[PDB]
Amino acid sequence: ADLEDNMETLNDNLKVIEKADNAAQVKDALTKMRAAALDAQKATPPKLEDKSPDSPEMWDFRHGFDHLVGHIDDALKLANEGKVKEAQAAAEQLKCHCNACHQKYR
Ligand code: HEC
Ligand SMILES: [Ca+2]
Ligand SMILES: [Ca+2]
């Protein structure tokens, strides 16, 4: 339930989505990723521990998860429609946003 746990949940469930057989597994994984992203959003990452909680870095860190959740919600709509392959493709759009936050704050 710490930041590192949230990241492990995000990473593990993206791989679940990639390997998924049906829409139910994609939806279940995305729902777990959604919770993890909103939990992570409340953390102070180690790199930013000396910054102000109101700093632009901390607000950029938090905003990154808002957009991640937006992408998760798009993939969730497709998974709820039974479109496994398009839900999976929508979920791959997450990866550039994982990487972008990591490049700044990992
Ligand atoms: C900021 C808005 C983030 C986004 C979006 C994602 N991640 Fe992340 N991640 C972030 C930080 C600050 C860290 C380091 C945390 C620490 O305590 O040092 C990480 C780390 C990871 C890791 C490896 C280390 C770990 O804590 O598990 C992984 C495997 C990881 N993150 C995965 C991941 C994925 C798959 C994401 C998109 C679905 C993703 N992260 C987004 C910050 C942010
Ligand atoms: Ca937590
Ligand atoms: Ca670290």
Question: Termini, distance in Å?
Answer: 18 Å
Q: Name the structural class.
A: mainly alpha
- Please give the count of helices: 5
Radius of gyration: 14 Å
How many domain regions? 1
Compounds present?
Answer: heme C, calcium ion
The sequence of SSEs as H and E is HHHHH
Number of strands: 0
Major sheet description: none
What percentage of the residues does DSSP assign to strands (E)?
A: under 5%
Helical fraction equals: over 70%
Shape label: elongated
PDB class: metal binding protein
Keywords: Designed protein, 4-helix bundle, electron transport, metal binding protein
Assembly: monomeric
Entry title: Cu(II)-bound structure of the engineered cyt cb562 variant, CH3
Verbal overview:
With 106 residues, this protein is an all-alpha fold. Helices cover 75% and strands 0% of the residues. Helix 2 runs antiparallel to helix 3 (56-80) and helix 3 (56-80) packs antiparallel against helix 4. It binds heme C and calcium ion (CA) (2 copies). The site of one calcium ion has 3 residues, from loops. The PDB classes it as metal binding protein.
Would you summarize the structure shown here?
It is classed as metal binding protein. This protein is mainly α and 106 residues long.
Keywords:
about 110 residues, mainly alpha, 5 helices, elongated, binds heme C, binds calcium ion, signal
